[PDB]
Amino acid sequence: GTLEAQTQGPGSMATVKVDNSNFQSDVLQSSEPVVVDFWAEWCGPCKTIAPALDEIAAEMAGQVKIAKVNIDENPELAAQFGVRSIPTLLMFKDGELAANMVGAAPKSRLADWIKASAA
Secondary structure (H helix, E strand, C coil): CCCCCCCCCCCCCCCCCCCCCCCCHHHHHHCEEEEEEECCCCCCHHHHHHHHHHHHHHHHHHHHHHCCCEEECCCCHHHHHHCCCEEEEEEECCCEEEEHHHHCHHHHHHHHEEEEEHC
16 A cells, blocks of 8 residues: 655645645634635735744644635635635634635734634
8 A cells, every 4th residue: 555644745834725625624623713814826915924824823823723725726615705805814713704804914913813803
């Protein structure tokens, strides 16, 4: 036979990449609140917040998970969750859609929104 990779491969070890294979297990069934960042390679504003989201994910380890959904790869998932422009972040808590925000923002504002949304 053959061995299994232990990670999702090169890419952020702070955030989790989500598609249809793990949206239920890693987002909807998560014990911690989960922020889902809907992004695409062509979204310049999304790129300007991606490092802040990695930092928040590392700092909030065990408290709030940060997931990444590429909308070009998961367009129906994005559409079903009402994502009609990016950047968009959604927070899920206990399988419920708790909050959203649109547009880029500095780390401080992202973190404030996460904390308020998870309250």
